[PDB]
Paper text:
[name] is a central component of the [name] subcomplex in the U2 small nuclear RNP (snRNP) and plays a pivotal role in the early stages of spliceosome assembly and branch point adenosine (BPA) recognition. [name] is intimately associated with three other proteins: [name], [name], and [name]. [name] is composed of some 20 HEAT repeats that form a superhelical spiral of one turn that wraps around [name]. [name], part of the U2 small nuclear RNP (snRNP), is targeted by splicing modulators, including [name], the first to enter clinical trials, and, more recently, H3B-8800.
Here, we present the cryogenic electron microscopy (cryo-EM) structure of the [name] subcomplex ([name], [name], [name], and [name]) bound to [name] at 3.95 Å. The cryo-EM map shows that [name] binds at the interface of [name] and [name]. [name] encircles [name] and, at the interface of the HEAT repeats 15–17, forms a deep channel from the top to the bottom face, where the BPA binds. [name] fills this channel like a plug. Residues V1110, V1114, L1066, and V1078 from [name] and residue Y36 from [name] make interactions with the compound. The macrocycle is positioned in part by the interactions with positive-charged residues R1074, R1075, and K1071 of [name] at the periphery of the channel. The cycloheptyl-piperazine is sandwiched between SF3B1Y1157 and PH5AR38. SF3B1R1074H and PHF5AY36C mutations confer the strongest levels of resistance (>500-fold). Both residues sit deep in the binding pocket on orthogonal sides and are situated adjacent to the diene tail of [name]. Our cryo-EM structure bound to [name] shows that [name] closely resembles the open conformation. Moreover, superposition of our [name]-bound structure with the RNA-bound structure from Bact shows that the diene tail region of [name] would clash with the BPA.
Author numbering:
A (entry chain A): 1001 to 1067, 1083 to 1222
B (entry chain A): 779 to 829, 834 to 889
C (entry chain A): 0 to 380, 383 to 444
D (entry chain B): 16 to 81
E (entry chain C): 490 to 1098, 1105 to 1304
F (entry chain D): 7 to 91
Write the structure that this text describes.
Amino acid sequence: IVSDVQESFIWVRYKRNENQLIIFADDTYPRWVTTASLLDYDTVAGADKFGNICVVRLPPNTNDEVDNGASQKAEVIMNYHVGETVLSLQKTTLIPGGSESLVYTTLSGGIGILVPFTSHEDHDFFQHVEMHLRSEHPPLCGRDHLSFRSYYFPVKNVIDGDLCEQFNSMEPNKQKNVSEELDRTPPEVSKKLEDIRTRYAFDYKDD
Amino acid sequence: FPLQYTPRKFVIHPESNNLIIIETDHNAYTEATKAQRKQQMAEEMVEAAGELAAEMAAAFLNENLPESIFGAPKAGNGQWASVIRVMNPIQGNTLDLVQLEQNEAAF
Amino acid sequence: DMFLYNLTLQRATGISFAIHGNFSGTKQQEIVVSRGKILELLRPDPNTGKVHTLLTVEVFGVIRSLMAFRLTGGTKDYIVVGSDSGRIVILEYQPSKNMFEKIHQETFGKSGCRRIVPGQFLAVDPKGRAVMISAIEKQKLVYILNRDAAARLTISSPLEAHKANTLVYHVVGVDVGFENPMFACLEMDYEEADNDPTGEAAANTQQTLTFYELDLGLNHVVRKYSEPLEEHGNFLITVPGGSDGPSGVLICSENYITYKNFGDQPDIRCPIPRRRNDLDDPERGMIFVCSATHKTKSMFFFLAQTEQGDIFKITLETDEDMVTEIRLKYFDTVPVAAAMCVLKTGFLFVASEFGNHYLYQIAHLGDDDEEPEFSSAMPLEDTFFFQPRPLKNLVLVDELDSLSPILFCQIADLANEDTPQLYVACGRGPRSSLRVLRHGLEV
Amino acid sequence: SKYIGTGHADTTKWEWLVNQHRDSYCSYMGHFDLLNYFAIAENESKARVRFNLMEKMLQPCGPPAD
Amino acid sequence: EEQKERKIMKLLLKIKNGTPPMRKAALRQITDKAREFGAGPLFNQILPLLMSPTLEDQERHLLVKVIDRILYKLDDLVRPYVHKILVVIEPLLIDEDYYARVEGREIISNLAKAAGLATMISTMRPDIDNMDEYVRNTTARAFAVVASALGIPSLLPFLKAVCKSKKSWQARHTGIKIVQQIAILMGCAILPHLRSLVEIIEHGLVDEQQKVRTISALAIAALAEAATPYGIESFDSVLKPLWKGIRQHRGKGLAAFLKAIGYLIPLMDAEYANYYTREVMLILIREFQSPDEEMKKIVLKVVKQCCGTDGVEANYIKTEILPPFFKHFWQHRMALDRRNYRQLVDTTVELANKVGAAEIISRIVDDLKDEAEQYRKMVMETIEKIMGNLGAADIDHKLEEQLIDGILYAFQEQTTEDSVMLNGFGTVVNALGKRVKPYLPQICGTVLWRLNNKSAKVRQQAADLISRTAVVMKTCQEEKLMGHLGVVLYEYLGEEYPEVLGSILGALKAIVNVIGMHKMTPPIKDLLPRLTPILKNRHEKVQENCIDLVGRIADRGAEYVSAREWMRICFELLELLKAHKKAIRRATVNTFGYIAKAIGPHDVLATLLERQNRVCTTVAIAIVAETCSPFTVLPALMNEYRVPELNVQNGVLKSLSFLFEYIGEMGKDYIYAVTPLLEDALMDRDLVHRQTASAVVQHMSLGVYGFGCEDSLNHLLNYVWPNVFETSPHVIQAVMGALEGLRVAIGPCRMLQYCLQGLFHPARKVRDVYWKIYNSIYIGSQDALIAHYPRIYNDDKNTYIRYELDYIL
Amino acid sequence: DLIFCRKQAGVAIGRLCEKCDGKCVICDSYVRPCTLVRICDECNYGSYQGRCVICGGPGVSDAYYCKECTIQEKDRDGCPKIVNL
Ligand SMILES: CC[C@H](O)[C@@H](C)[C@H]1O[C@@H]1C[C@@](C)(O)/C=C/C=C(\C)[C@H]1OC(=O)C[C@H](O)CC[C@@](C)(O)[C@@H](OC(=O)N2CCN(C3CCCCCC3)CC2)/C=C/[C@@H]1C
Ligand SMILES: [Zn+2]
Ligand SMILES: [Zn+2]
Ligand SMILES: [Zn+2]
């Protein structure tokens, strides 16, 4: 994995039989890369100066045995503006007996994690929670939130966390409006959002 | 745990389980250039053409100001410095120290 | 489709703008710090100093300006916030509801920090009756904060101040005595610098300290005066005017400090002193970074700070409207701050830009010294050479922790308990350190 | 046309070039943490970085052609 | 000659009668040549045209701003003419139009800062001491205007110079008139100057003249209205000559005293308002029974605002203030006055919001039984505002019996149309609810009694009254009676009086909304065909009301009615989208969604007659296509798409336009089959194809925004792009907005990468193109372009590398 | 003839005659309006206190921008009043 300073990551295969370095895959999207930490044989979890976490997967159409930079490419699966600068990625497991978590620390002293899901039903549940929570409760300083994460790039396939966790903070009549708008009780909603943190991260509640 | 310069990067020792700290600054003086710089400027305060009936160097060579709180003698445009250190995370103490050239800084 | 869900564990702890006041409405006093997007309110303890955090709130945007004021006769300070998008908000605290009540928004410009769009520099009047927003280009808007008899904030239309090809270094409004309000600005022209083939207008072009005037009766903004400066200028204090002390601005700049009232006022210069036995290059100057007006009913003294950790107790001297002496006198040596605040009963909140955050209690008031005071009245062609010295006035109450700027974090186990520790090497200069992070209960 | 940064059928590479410089520097000042990046990168203070940027607002790319 | 400058001052006629080039340019002519021209023919020609009373609103708005724009510059040539301009603008400050008054404020404001203050003083010297009340009137208001122009401390030494001079009662009266008109005009920002102004106007309170006592303390009032509400201590010397003057004098100056005291404690502290309220209250008791309308205005205002302080005790209000108040301030002669009608109402309401409910209404329970119409309207509004503010949680037993006996008692005799019995008893039952258990067949039996007869004027008010008593009859646990007037209303469907007919139908809507659909007393299979012929009517009330009735029945009891009748409902509701009422179209859309949920997309078809407007059929296709999933209607439109023929392809493209326009975000899984459909569409055939299909590119591009779809849209984009070089302005305009949508969905990067090719090409024709697209890119979201700039390496003379993007840690 | 005015927007709200009620202002849409409209203060005076923004009649109802022009971000420009010339 080559971290070019203007172009994106560059995939290089080395010929052990021939002593030759080969570039076979590239990008059309120039990103100002700082750091990376890989997860598998095909996805590269990068970063940016300005604050764009990006992950690009290699398509399985990429011929491993070959001889703008390449006609073949590698397509984006994620673009998610943070707003600060990320410096050291490391996939790990924070609590014993736990799961995977792609930890991003950032420049301003903060610590952010990332999450894989279980089901399209859970995901469209949280997605409808976003659909109504955005316009039915606007942000504080009036920033158009989709136009905030969608700052440089169109956002692809991320659910925000802290926007969707204001149900612990809104007014109770709007808890009635939203919880009854999706036909679910607030102990069911708040217990569902207890489950994620007690599952992955440092939450302490005992069943 | 206290350090000296702005640590760029460090790695784990796998075998004995220790740490390898590398430290690098732009606009800084190292230990030797600070030392002979201070003594040379002391000579330059003997050169001031006047009784040299008493010395400032008796107290002037006494206290190096702790750079923790008393600021840092920032200088230059192409100046550099470099320090490499091994450290044990159980206790506090340090293992080995290496210092390098003035205008050659570790990455 | 491998969707992802963001979450956070430790909020950003980097202070960038600290204003303060009374937002509880009571006699007690609270500090609005500002992080990158996490606005946060605090409270010190007047008995043991432990800063008990009270409210923290995401804004999901970019906090670019942050100025407090209070209307005539009120007792509840507000906050103005400038946004990244071209809309300004006004907030207000609620001690029982425990949230920020919005008041009013205005729409004036597009989104994103452009050139010609305002939101960059924010000017408030010291009487709370006027407020001004200003970019680094022609669009500068002025609002009027009228209060009706319904205890709300009847804002007005925007006021146009368009002007082709100008810059702005800084804008702080002027403590005028109940008049058509005056707004100061360090402009810079460059339409001279856009035609010359030889290109000498990159030289020979300097700041003007242009003043601006609102007209309440006739509803238009007119310009007051315009006078060239000499050397280029960073930030400006408003001298407290009204009935206590004169009305001016004192321009800190490259190695000098300069009062300049408009009028028949002669302008004092006084140079910034340098340490005994420097260990630097004499090419680099010395300017300032922060400023702290300590307005008391009887008097006022400033405390501004150099690059290299030196607080200066500027004790202004003057006449009724003329000025007499800007005499200087250092206060002590603390680590570097980017903004700081002084609290009643003598608390000083040194808010660093890097590493920890401090809180000092003023143990000795007044001027009780043996190292000599400086002046501008002395004849010297040689600058003042002062002494550096340990901690003598202030005392460190408590050390508020922070972690920024985290450079290189690794998550691994280097001990014999289960949980992977967080080894973070982070810091700045010789204050940097290595920090072991764990996560259990507060032992 | 009256908006600043409008091109037309005679605007040249120096004009377009110095425009993208000037709004570049306004964007650098526009953020809040890229200045912390430049202040951590080369060793300065933030006010020094802001002043150097504002002084390099009218300097750069020198004199025009002819 | 200067009459020659009148001949060039026919440019005024070019200004007032002007295009924006004549107004802007001619404005720049005279405003760039004002001091060049002079001062005499200026007013000689501006002045009588301003004098002409047939000037209009925007015309006069020209003919004040023009004096502003040329009085940018003249500063000292008005100095002989300040007197003349003031004599001509003697009117236009106190006159009828608020627009005229504020234009007078603007012109004398600008002339006031234009001239010199001492010239204003010695020029407006001979009008202080004339004989005439009207010239002291207009002159003192002119002083207020120039005071609002030049600020307060510029006038304060002159105010002291007049307020103490003993020369004329006309003059001292004039000076205090100036202070009051300054307070009314300025208003808000005289708080810090207020102690100073008190020390000017304070010594007009112990003087021999009833006039100066009157206008002095009246000016104290008109200042404290602006001081309201603090608790300020700037009123200290004000307390004593008032406190003496209360028991000292009697009269219209005592109206001027109590007016001031009411304006003087909305703000004062609790102990001060306590002791001083107790002080005023005894003489106020003494001055209750005074007759005059002004007197009742004053002391009714006084008890309103001395009650307004929170520090006043409800023991003292209830036990001490109220029994002479309700004892003495009620006549049945109180009818005609709206000022003391509404003022007595609002005063007693603001009593009740502090003192309670059951005591206030329990002192007008027996007052209800009267032969007096407007009187019963008054106490009806009283009980209704008290119950609407405080409710019935205070209202209790041994009261409620005589309450309902009162309400139904007076309710039995009611003839003329009033809204306070309907809104009245509606809010009453809003506070009653289930609590009225043992009474309901008397209520609804009396309702049917008023419903059998009486020329529909109380069948409408009673019908509305069922429509706002329905929810209690849900919560009542009695189920037979509402069935009984249910079938009585089921008879009640034939009437040519439509304004009442909408109330019967709205009563039917509020009933059917709350009635249990299990065991409907009426049969809906014969309700609905009797409900059908209403919907060919003309009037918006019965149209909206009946459409809403169709949608509530369809919203609830969908397990009943034959789909034949539902089908005639669908086609009957089709043409109603073409109305001119947004409420009609709101109802028609929503309930059309519910009956399209009843039948659905399956039976309904598309090829409906070579016919006209058809946008209601288009929106019908849209709402069916949303209310069920478009998996039927998108390949059905493909069957409508795959015909090789003219006159059709345009129409199905427009149905795509309104289609994606309506759905947006849920049509994200339904874009793929649209893409070859948009290939034969988007290929180069005809103007309507390119134009409307490009608008479909825009609307699709806005529906998918942040929703996981790009490469489809890029494959669109490569077919979009070569269409740019086209001459017609409409279709290039749709290309422009098309590229703006492709900007916001695709991103700035790929737009610019398909932009940079021929930016510097040696040909002006293609340059106008690529620059024009570049500007339309550039205005929208320039701040995103920072990372996506292509880096260009430097030449010899200038530095082109931003090293800020190239620092390395 | 018909052209936008495009000046600074104050606290003035536009009005619409009821015949042209359901439309948007610029793009002439009808779909999902959820936003407020401000207009300038120089064209809001005198004979124009309540007036249809588009055609010039007695206005009974407000003006809203569609959500398409909000996501497109066109509302931040000058005052959208169509002026005859
Ligand atoms: C020269 C020829 C002439 O120009 C000729 C074409 C002209 O005379 C015709 C015009 C004519 C009569 O056909 C106009 C018909 C107009 C309509 C039927 C519009 O009616 C309305 O606007 C009324 C009101 O403003 C909006 C009602 C509403 C909200 O249901 C509307 O539909 C919507 O916009 N929705 C309803 C749904 N809602 C949700 C939010 C959730 C998710 C799925 C998406 C939608 C979004 C907003 C109707 C628009 C009609 C096109
Ligand atoms: Zn306008
Ligand atoms: Zn209209
Ligand atoms: Zn629109």
